[PDB]
């Protein structure tokens, strides 16, 4: 099974006073491990998972230095894009950036990412070949021209295929007690009468990790979809996740219906049946 390291950055201009609001977070898989908040008192990269705390002073100094430099660049970027897009200094705008790498089932490099949005829309993104750029518009095109001339993709490719994968693997080992523990969903079904004639079957998946999961309803062994409802996967707040899927059925016919649960923590898919 695969693993990822991701860094997410949000910069929001504050045209009334001062510098942009800047928030950075780093994830390994679905586990946040670092943060930087411009509005917090420390002004340092801070730990958010026990296993990154093993890292020494030089790591924290180096990660603080890099994230602060990055925040100043986003401040510049906000000014640059406001210029590109002919916008006034009066409104607030958002630059987002995400970068990172996956390792595959063979524990080697699988994919690299490095992409930006402006005011919630795609701006520029490194393609899967880690050699070319997708520029959404003519503003992003001028960024692309600059970056191609400066060999920005080569410098990113080296990080993504090297440092990124190497440190991801380091974290996965140092944090293995949780990072390489799969928490299979804790599943049950509940039953709610809607009328004398129909009832809701709700299939629960609780306390699972990682977040990726599939819940499917069947009737007489065939996928259903009609008269179903499926909430978006949500965080429990303890590092695990929750989801449910529901189906409305004729009362007395509950036994026909099965909930199917797929998750990395489950050797074989689970089947739940009210009966």
């Amino acid at each position: 099974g695969s693993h990822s390291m991701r860094y997410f950055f949000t910069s929001v201009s504050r045209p009334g006073r001062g510098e942009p609001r800047f928030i950075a977070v780093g994830y390994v898989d679905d586990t946040q491990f670092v943060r930087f908040d411009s509005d917090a008192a420390s002004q340092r990269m801070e730990p958010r998972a026990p296993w990154i705390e093993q890292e020494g002073p030089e790591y924290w100094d180096g990660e603080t230095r890099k994230v602060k430099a990055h925040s100043q660049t986003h401040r510049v970027d906000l000014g640059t894009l406001r210029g590109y897009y002919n916008q006034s200094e009066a409104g607030s705008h958002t630059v987002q950036r995400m970068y990172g790498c996956d390792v595959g089932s063979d524990w080697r490099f699988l994919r690299g990412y490095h992409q930006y949005a402006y005011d919630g829309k795609d701006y520029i993104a490194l393609k899967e070949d880690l050699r070319s750029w997708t520029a959404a518009d003519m503003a992003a095109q001028t960024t692309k021209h600059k970056w191609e001339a400066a060999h920005v993709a080569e410098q990113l490719r080296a990080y993504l295929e090297g440092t990124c994968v190497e440190w991801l693997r380091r974290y996965l080992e140092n944090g293995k007690e949780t990072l390489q523990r799969t928490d299979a969903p804790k599943t049950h079904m509940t039953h709610h009468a809607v009328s004398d004639h129909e009832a809701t079957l709700r299939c629960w998946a609780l306390s699972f990790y990682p977040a990726e999961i599939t819940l499917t309803w069947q009737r007489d062994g065939e996928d259903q979809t009609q008269d179903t409802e499926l909430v978006e996967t949500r965080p429990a707040g303890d590092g695990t996740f929750q989801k449910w899927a529901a189906v409305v059925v004729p009362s007395g016919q509950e036994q026909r219906y099965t909930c199917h649960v797929q998750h990395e923590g489950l050797p074989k898919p689970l089947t739940l049946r009210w009966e």
Binding site: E63, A69, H70, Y99, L156
Partner: peptide, 9 residues
């Protein structure tokens, strides 16, 4: 571990 290169739009 963050990237070192300081890329600007």
């Amino acid at each position: 571990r963050q990237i070192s290169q300081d890329v600007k739009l």
